[PDB]
Write a protein that binds this DNA or RNA. Structure first.
Ligand SMILES: [Mg+2]
Ligand SMILES: [Mg+2]
Ligand SMILES: [Mg+2]
Ligand SMILES: [Mg+2]
Ligand SMILES: [Mg+2]
Ligand SMILES: [Mg+2]
Ligand SMILES: [Mg+2]
Ligand SMILES: [Mg+2]
Ligand SMILES: [Mg+2]
Ligand SMILES: [Mg+2]
Lengths: 108, 58, 205, 113, 134
RNA sequence: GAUGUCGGCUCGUCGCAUCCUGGGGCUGAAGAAGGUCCCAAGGGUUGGGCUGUUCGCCCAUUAAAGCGGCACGCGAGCUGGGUUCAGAACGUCGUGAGACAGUUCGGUCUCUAUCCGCUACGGGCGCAGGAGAAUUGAGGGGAGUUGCUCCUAGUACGAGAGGACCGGAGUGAACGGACCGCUGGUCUCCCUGCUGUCGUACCAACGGCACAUGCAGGGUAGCUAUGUCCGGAACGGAUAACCGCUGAAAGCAUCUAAGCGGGAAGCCAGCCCCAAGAUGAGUUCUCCCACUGUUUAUCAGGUAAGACUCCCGGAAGACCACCGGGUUAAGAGGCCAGGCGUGCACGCAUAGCAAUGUGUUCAGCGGACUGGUGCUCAUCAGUCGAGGUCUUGACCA
RNA sequence: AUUCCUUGUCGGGUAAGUUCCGACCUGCACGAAAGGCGUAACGAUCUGGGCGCUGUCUCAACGAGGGACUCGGUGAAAUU
RNA sequence: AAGGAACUUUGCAAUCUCACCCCGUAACUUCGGAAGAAGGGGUCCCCACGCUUCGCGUGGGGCGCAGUGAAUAGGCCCAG
């Protein structure tokens, strides 16, 4: 509509790297996201969801990863924004051998 | 049977009232730079078969 | 009043403190002032601002002149703003300010000809227990011999979209002057690359 | 809306059959005449194909073997016509439109190498 | 989300194994006991929302019983709750906690993790029997 | 020589004798909760179970869960359960053929809109020169719901129990607009995996067909909700009921006959959208300019500014239309780079009797995404398009 | 499938049941070859219920193909 | 997606099941059946070993989300 000469592509980068964070590698295989649960009253907790990564959707500010796990009898899937301020640090636990970017089938 | 159907015959006039839009615009023929017959803008001159050089065969 | 022109560039993620926030990046590109209008000259008070630049080899002899009357430089887009002023040119710097609520208006994406389910919501019907009216199709247009006709406005399939939309009180998250970039909370209407007009809130609490 | 990016008029298996089919012709005769549109759809597909052929190794060959089910033709594209376009940034194949037709009134066209 | 006819699992020794939804109240825990409805609509129960329910299965021996009509608080939706950091959670099955007009678990303890959401919801005691609060 | 019938579904819209919200008077109105009458139709008025039902009874909620009208609104809109065809059955009546206050199971509901009306979209002409672009707003539409909690205040009030007005804060529901960053959904050939068969001589590698994707797994752009973001406002003007100041006719009393003021979710304005065919056809800025044609072809003909035609495209679209480019070029394609998706290629090597594993290989492949680049095509060229009526008035030297 | 008053009454099941099941009986107008009552197996039979799955539904959404649209060829109809 | 008959006259329609081995299988019954009741498991490739051969059994190995791996291909039950 406005036909200015412009790389819409980058303008975005430049307003996205100021909110983008790298993390260990991993691809699947166990992980342990030690995240801080700052929400209890004023008190700032510290939880540690851990287990099988099942997807690495997106990139840039939006990049994230999904981790499946079975807490106390009932399966749980958490989804993390690589730059979610709610995350202190991620760590591989044990590289896995699979053959497809997803794993969904693992929900069973 | 034929559910909708028209209530009266339409005025020879009314017939026309609409047809006031079926007049074909005619080609804007142009003249070749090379055999000079008239060509159709942006296509190969049917007659000599050109488009700067001779594309189609004579 | 206060206001500017810009292009919608896209949406993305941004955190503020610990609250993830969808934002829409507008390029309120700088804006030349090509024509001031006073009630004493044009019947009212307003301002003519400009936008996407345009190659002079593409500028009408007439437009050239208009533009010359205020040595500016063919823009290609002009728009007026009311009760506005400023000298020089209009840029968001010192115009909008992080925190302000604004009314980003632009032109809705264009959905062509749409039925009623998708344009007025309707509800169509039965998709199994008998039909030919499956899902969409509006039901009945009215009543009988009385108001033996339909009402001026019944909702039916029309060209949906391609409209002027305004959205109100959207937080102005970050302003990156000198990049005439501006991230706005929430979403603005109109497809990426389209014109968008950000203004002070027309009506804010 | 419908803000996608492609073209059909037949199904999924068909558009394929066509592209491949005309793809072959053009490559086998450097210039075929066809419906203006059937051309435009073809243009890129054949071009992409040449850029593949344009690598030499068995691989690039066998990729081309997937859209050229005529050995003779593939060999041509592979060793005769691909090698030649070596120096140009891919992008060779031009369309030339012709007269309108009688039978259907459809404006025919030229797609040449 | 949860809605009428939507069977949940009970995350408590309340005695009722499985309950079918009957209505989604607009979960009013506050003030004195549980505040009253916030609208007569609201169609989906989301973790931390209170529903009304009809016990479709209770175990032999237990406060609650089959055919009882109770109030429960949704603690595990297989939907997806989305926190302010921007993370996302979703449990394999939907489960609730039968409760009383004070919003206290009719049971002597909760079972399975529970939505941290319940915490902002001020449903403190529940949280308190929660083996976890992911 | 035919005005289709009950109910429902859909789509509505109107009256008020208002169900809920809003303003009030009186109360046997302590407060809180009510009753009642008056003003008031802006908006709103849940989901289930039983029944063909309308009704109604009940479950669970709600501010509320209003009553009616529109051919008991709406079948050239749908259903077709109910009932006014043919089959069959029971009870009952009839000697019968048959019948019915009845009950029961079964039983074809007709692609093609002329006119008006309606929603969208163009063409023409007009709007006293010919054009490019920016607007005023006459008028018209959309919207117009409500809870809960907190503060004030555990105050006023009340023996107490219980427990506010007013004002001020938050946070939901449903609805609607926009949107696709997110979370998801799809993505009909973008990647991979798998079977059977036929083929490319064979092996190996591939293709077809097994839907109109053979099936499976996944998935960019796009489009999309159960996903996001925002909104229903404030203030204002005039009012309803109602309440009041000054105040005679009735040296008193009186909201009244002079006069004046306060006062509702309602009226008008304000908010978003449309809008000069507002033929009363408006305003502003800019551009092109005053040509040619002997009472034989009386008017059209070159042309300016400008635009169309055509080509290549589009977050625009049924068509038209709208936007962008069209070599003084980055418009689209291709091509290069990157991105993202698939998840490790062909080949060779090595391990293994083999199936396979491993290595070269974070390979290989590649729709729709970001840039770059003159490789392809946007060639050439045609068509159209002003010289501005008259009257009065005002100004110029 | 013979009941009008009638959604009879109680029980069953459901959160809630004008229907269904079981009893009762006051059988409007059951009943013994116009057969009475019962019965395993058989039913594109009719009724009520449950498990399972599901776009039937909350609500729709994306995708495909054939029409619908547009150009060239041919070119009806009922109605009036 | 989530939910799962809330649809609605009626789950109408459309899913699910869906082949062949094996384990297993109720009330009731004229003992025949009800029964494919219900339910559960297996199913491809390679190698060795034996079998009656096509084929199959035992054991070990292998690959994928998945092996009647694509087409043909019962949804089941309770009561009336
Ligand atoms: Mg995803
Ligand atoms: Mg629907
Ligand atoms: Mg009141
Ligand atoms: Mg009608
Ligand atoms: Mg997506
Ligand atoms: Mg698929
Ligand atoms: Mg006032
Ligand atoms: Mg087009
Ligand atoms: Mg142009
Ligand atoms: Mg019986």
């Amino acid at each position: 509509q406005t036909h200015i000469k412009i790389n819409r592509g980058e303008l975005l980068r430049g307003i996205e790297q100021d909110h983008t964070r790298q993390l260990p590698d991993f691809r699947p295989g166990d992980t342990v996201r030690v995240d801080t649960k700052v929400r209890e009253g004023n008190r700032t907790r510290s939880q540690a969801f851990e287990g099988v990564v099942i997807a690495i959707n997106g990139s840039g500010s939006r990049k994230s990863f999904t981790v499946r796990k079975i807490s106390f009898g009932e399966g749980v899937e958490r989804v993390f924004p690589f730059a979610s301020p709610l995350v202190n640090q991620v760590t591989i636990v044990e590289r896995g051998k699979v053959r497809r970017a997803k794993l969904y089938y693992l929900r069973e | 049977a034929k559910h909708p159907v028209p209530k009266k015959k339409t005025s020879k006039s009314k017939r026309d009232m609409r047809r006031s839009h079926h007049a074909l615009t005619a080609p804007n023929l142009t003249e070749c730079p090379q055999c000079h017959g008239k060509k159709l803008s942006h296509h190969i001159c049917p007659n000599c078969g050109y488009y700067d050089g001779r594309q189609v065969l004579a | 009043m206060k206001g500017i022109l810009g292009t919608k560039i896209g949406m993305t993620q941004i955190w503020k403190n610990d609250r993830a926030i969808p934002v829409t990046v507008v390029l309120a590109g700088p804006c030349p002032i090509v024509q001031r209008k006073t009630a004493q000259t044009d019947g009212y008070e307003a301002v003519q601002i400009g936008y996407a630049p345009k190659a002079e080899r593409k500028v009408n002899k007439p437009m050239q002149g208009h533009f010359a009357k205020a040595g500016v430089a063919p823009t290609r887009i002009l728009r007026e703003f009311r009760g506005f002023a400023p000298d020089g040119d209009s840029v968001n710097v010192d115009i909008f300010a992080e925190g302000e609520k604004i009314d980003a208006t632009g032109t809705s994406k264009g959905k062509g000809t749409q039925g009623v389910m998708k344009r007025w919501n309707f509800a169509g019907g039965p998709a199994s227990h008998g039909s030919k009216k499956w899902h969409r199709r509006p039901g009945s247009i009215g009543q009988r011999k009385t108001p033996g006709r339909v009402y001026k406005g019944k909702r039916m399939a029309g060209h949906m979209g391609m409209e002027r939309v305004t959205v109100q009180n959207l937080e102005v998250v970050e302003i990156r002057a000198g990049e005439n970039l501006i991230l706005v909370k929430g979403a603005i209407p109109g497809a990426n690359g389209g014109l968008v007009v950000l203004r002070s809130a027309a009506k804010a609490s | 809306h419908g803000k996608a990016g492609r073209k059909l008029n037949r199904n999924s298996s068909a558009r394929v059959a066509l592209a491949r089919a005309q793809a072959t012709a053009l490559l086998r005769e450097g210039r075929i005449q066809t419906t203006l549109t059937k051309a435009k759809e073809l243009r890129p597909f054949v071009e992409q194909l040449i850029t593949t052929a344009k690598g030499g190794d068995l691989h690039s060959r066998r990729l081309v073997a997937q859209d050229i089910h005529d050995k003779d033709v593939v060999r041509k594209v592979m060793d005769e016509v691909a090698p030649k376009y070596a120096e140009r940034p891919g992008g060779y194949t031009r369309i030339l439109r012709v007269g309108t037709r009688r039978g259907d009134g459809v404006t025919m066209a030229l797609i040449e190498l | 989300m949860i809605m009428p006819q939507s069977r949940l699992d009970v995350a408590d020794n309340s005695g009722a194994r499985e309950i079918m939804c009957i209505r989604v109240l607009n979960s009013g825990i506050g003030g004195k006991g549980l505040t009253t409805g916030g609208g007569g609509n609201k169609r989906y129960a989301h973790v931390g929302d209170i529903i009304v329910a009809s016990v479709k299965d209770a175990a032999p021996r237990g406060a609650v019983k089959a055919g009882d009509v109770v109030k429960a608080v949704v603690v595990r939706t297989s939907h997806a709750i989305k926190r302010a950091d921007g993370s996302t959670i979703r449990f394999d099955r939907n489960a609730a906690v039968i409760i009383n007009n004070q919003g206290e678990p009719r049971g002597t303890r909760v079972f399975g993790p529970v939505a941290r959401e319940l915490r902002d919801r001020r449903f403190m005691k529940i949280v308190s029997l929660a083996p976890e609060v992911l």
